[PDB]
């Protein structure tokens, strides 16, 4: 009906505590009368400036502005409107599209991040791929993607090289996953698998599913998509002439690092949890989370059989950088969210500093901490049945969740009583 | 520092919505300025009187009184202080003493509710029992209690009387309970049981334990004591000349109905829950709960093998009334707190209407139901380790409780992994 | 390697307790040695015949048969091989095709149960629908289904009639569900809503989803399918000349009774739980559960505002039978697992006896009991993530389930700590 | 009835797989015929000796012995009887006495472990204290214990010294615990806190309670007692001339380390779980657990504010050894169950190696770990209501426990719904 504002009122003088006059200019333009509680304070925490009061005001713009001007006549502030309030995040699987296509699609992506590649044919490829993923509607499967003989041959080259180095120093869990794929996905030197097949495989495995895209445009919204246990992909490939170094994550990147790790139950869980943090997360909070993701997913360093092995997506997609990180001259601390919260990094050169990991569970634990540690006006949960999020803002929502929780509990109870 | 009041303000005219003048008299005597949000309302729920604004006022008594007078000059009310706020309840086992015997001790009880018995001997007995129960400090065991030959002979008489009709029509669970007692408690025709013995028997059995009580003075505090899984016990006996009908619950009453019922795990827990209702519960809510106890505990009918049986404590303590209730001429509905909420009853003659019970579980269930729909500014839980109450007023308390819950949970989980 | 048998040995004489000779014919043809424990018994349970010993025998068919013959020479039985042990049930959403088409497809169904209709066009419709549903592969969506103007007009007629009687006595929850459909699904008098759209709506609602079916061939496997929260649907319609009475469930049956109820969260859960019980249930147990389904799903009688309302699928798929059941002359007992375990019924005449329902939760409860009461060699659970069944046969499986359980639990914990 | 044996059979030759002859000598003396399954094996695990068959035998001693002799005539072993099988442990708070006094009491302890002390008065003190503690019956309160002025003065001396050095390097949580004592317990320089007072304070804090003991004779049974959250304590004093170094734990030891630590909730629970490990645990397993206790309870190092602080009982009971451990010249690893599983140690001089602790939670975790990987034929749990152990040997016990678990769960649920 009327025009409501949001709390942003920091005057300059300290006298605006009861404001001593301005509650009247609030009410004379139809303010409100709730339970009042704010008096002179800051006794143990001395050195106190003016007090942050939130005199909410919802009337026509003229009256609210005139009364805020009246306050600024005696105070030194006006209640500026439009509180962003953790700007936004979706709630349901389908909604992962419009808010995120409208922010990540119908943008003409130049050939490569390096300005200009003499790959007009690649330009055709990427444009057509985009105009496949662009109009993607959730729930509908993905149309088949052809591949010419050149990306075929390069997939083959990298298949060989990588498989050649796979037993070498890689995560044995990743490696048996890869074997499972090679026998199930359709991983072969000659032929490169589609995404629909492998993604359906993964759905049976973990329920995670791929999604197609051209640009990562919002790591924020990217991490959001992953919160839904849905991974995003770019069905196009590096330049053939760029087989080993990837100037940008491609199929060789994703299909090779990400998925043949993502197959794990609890590791995929952890991956999801990362996104679950990101819901509506602030710009700099988003940056922190994405930064974590950097040192923990694309660039993740496990420890198999007591000795250290590698499990990072990009690492497990890189050929020579793979060897680089494995070598000693790159530094490896251990994983910590805070230590990674502002841990610097570059993008192109062979990254050196790393956060070694020993247990996916431990990663989950530090995530739980930092996320809980991440301030939040709310909380969220993911329902598996609906595949959608569970808004957690009230004791009542918690009750709603734990109801079904206890349901499954007694289910296990009856099951156990039955067994034996 | 200052003098705070509680929200009791209902004017007569409807103009006091913003109070229209009285916020000024609030602030001129040092009111407070927090977030205000309340305006004229009752659009869909039309036909509305004045609005209930909560303008708290914590200044000196003169200032608050003068400003409330200023309001009542234009409004038609004053913010009445001293909110009772669910008057009181304890928190810890030992605390069951001071505030509850300040209200239930040092009251000189005459001989009986009937004015005057010519049983000066019974007067001596009652006085001495009291001056034992009087100075009882929690945790310390109960001193031994002697019993002259007459209450002995009567205990024997009643033992016999019941024992013949005991197996008849009673709750088989209570029956085998008394079996375990007669073989363990010391229940015998000749000798009367002490109370500490059977008390220990219950602590091993269920953790419930006795407490000496002279007067029931507060069913409220009585139900409270129960909430702690502690049942106040009478250390005194009906008149010998009053063997069958007791004008008041005695050792014969409780020793025979209550304890050989309290033997059950879940039924004891249920009893406890009834107490858990009583926490600070309002006077009339207290009356409702006590009423519930009436038709549910001393006077309750079970149903063994599909045929109804007796399980009410007083019933399981009465001899002739016992025959009355099991007979057809008294009415028997089924248990329902709401149906029992204002279900009438007398006390002296043979009670007719009963709320039959199918299973203790059902009782627990509708108890949870009413307790929930029992309005309460809070909630309470019982810590089994410390035997204390668990104040439930914030998500944080719930959190700290469910923490230990999960602890025991994974304890079970590890055990399970171990077993087999 | 060798040929193993299963325990089917019930001799006639009582001597085979230690077998007294036949352990030797077991071993001379390569018997085996676990912990030997079986002797003469049945002391308190006197009147005992021969004892059931399980001397497993895994050798070539000649040796096992010859030794069983040696036993039958002195005993009176042979260890009959190939114990089916509720021979089958699927585990994953995919397998819901192979064993399920192999059990329900490639069977040429005549026009209707009544031998012969003069509806060659209906025969064409049924054949084409089948040869759509026949080749259904899991995960792939359902191709569109056209509808000629006659089923259109009849859908319109029934839409009207039913809508004319919707407020009449129908489940108000179901009814508001239908409102959500009419505003969301595409429920309209003119047009027949497809299955894919409404089923997607349902997945958002409940996660349940449809599956095309022509022949119900196995109610057993039908209930199995629904255990996966997947309802088999018949994309065809009753005879136009048979608008009100349906000799067989059709779209007008299913879309009109089933889904406008199934949309409830907990009721859908309960429905699934039924199937979960049926998971590889035994033939007679299958009959029992299907019988239950009869009186509890298509024909279920709810109770809104304390007065009884209708909520059975077939009921709210029936037009005049719907009026029949609502009337008094058909009997309505209350829902009971056992009373419905063998409650008789016919199929054609307007059914009389009903099992009135007061709360879906109570139906859940009676299920939980009877299911648990249903003996099984094991138990099972449903994972929502993988959408697959969880086999429960060992403490270890219970453990691994409880692990994720506690995971979600601590998720709630951290959320709770965060909120507020 | 008959005489049963236990599985102890390891022949020498490899021929005893089906025993090839000895099943007959078993059955001719009334053997038993259960389901048998074991043949020649060790195909993937080649290089195998004879097979371990469990042919039990319960007939009179003559038959079992003669048939075992017949086996040893052809095999090379006899089924040795009397399997101790984690020899014993109590179950309830009461039984903690007899099976533990019969093993740890009525033993005349000499003056000191060092043979001969000219402390005849100390001998009197120890004798009288024993003849108080020895005949203690569980649940009964503790008679008062006097102390002459000398142990009083030395108590004061150490109170001063330690309190002086308490702020130095100690656990801040422990330190505020000490403050809580000094203000509530009766911990003061001049007068020494009794045991009953502080034990009550602990039942308030945690429910832990002390118990008088002269000799620790069975660390096994000692740790068992602690599993009940009950700590055995020695109500006598070190030699006055031995104030700083104690050749043995005394009140100056226990009152100073143990109780001012146990005040923590989760640390108390952790301590309890340690005892929980000890349930019937084997001799060398007992040694392992006690060894753990050594480096983790009397001698443990915490880490407050990131810098290491002390929290070991004996450490915070030692004065000069206290100064020793905190200093650098002794080694301090971190707490690791396995690294502490067989970590060597001495007793008398100033111990060097230490297993530093970051959080009590960490200890809880590694305890859960080792306990799990501690083999046990079963599991156990502790009921708070009954204060007694919960046997875990079958799913059904798990069931009945998790039942109450879910009970408390929905208790929290109803509370949650109520709150707000
Ligand atoms: Fe990537
Ligand atoms: Fe009573
Ligand atoms: Fe149907
Ligand atoms: Fe000690």
Numbering used by the authors:
A (entry chain C), B (entry chain D), C (entry chain B), D (entry chain A): 78 to 497
Please give me the paper's original passages concerning this structure.
The structure of human apo-TH (3.9 Å resolution) shows a planar, tetrameric core that comprises the CD and OD domains, and two smaller densities on opposite sides and 15 Å apart from the central structure. The final map, with an estimated resolution of 3.9 Å (FSC = 0.143), shows a central tetrameric structure formed by the CD and OD domains that is 110 Å long, 86 Å wide and 38 Å high. The two small masses of the RDs, separated 15 Å from the main body, have a dimeric structure and a parallelepiped-like shape of 40 × 40 × 22 Å. The two masses were placed on opposite sides of the central part of the TH structure, allowing full access to the active sites of the enzyme. In the 3D reconstruction, many structural features could be assigned to α-helices and loops in the central structure formed by CD and OD domains, in particular the α-helices involved in tetramerization. In the RD domains, four α-helices were clearly visible, two of them involved in dimer formation. However, there were areas of lower resolution, so we sought to determine the local resolution of each area of the map using MonoRes34, which showed a non-isotropic resolution distribution of the map, between 2 Å at the central part of the tetrameric structure and 10 Å at the RDs. An attempt to improve the local resolution of the latter by treating them as single particles did not result in a noticeable increase to resolution (7.1 Å), suggesting that this dimeric structure has intrinsic flexibility. The structural stabilization of the N-terminal residues 39–77 in the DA-bound state, both in full-length TH and THNΔ35, was necessary for their visualization, as they were not observed in the apo-TH state (whose structural model starts at the ACT domain) or in the THS40p conformation.
Tyrosine hydroxylase (TH) catalyzes the rate-limiting step in the biosynthesis of dopamine (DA) and other catecholamines, and its dysfunction leads to DA deficiency and parkinsonisms. Mammalian AAAHs mainly present as homotetramers with a three-domain subunit structure: an N-terminal regulatory domain (RD) that consists of a structured ACT (aspartate kinase-chorismate mutase-TyrA) domain preceded by a less structured N-terminal tail of varying length; a central catalytic domain (CD) that contains the active site iron and binding-sites for substrate and cofactor; and a C-terminal oligomerization domain (OD) responsible for dimerization and/or tetramerization. Inhibition by catecholamines and reactivation by S40 phosphorylation are key regulatory mechanisms of TH activity and conformational stability. We used Cryo-EM to determine the structures of full-length human TH without and with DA, and the structure of S40 phosphorylated TH, complemented with biophysical and biochemical characterizations and molecular dynamics simulations.
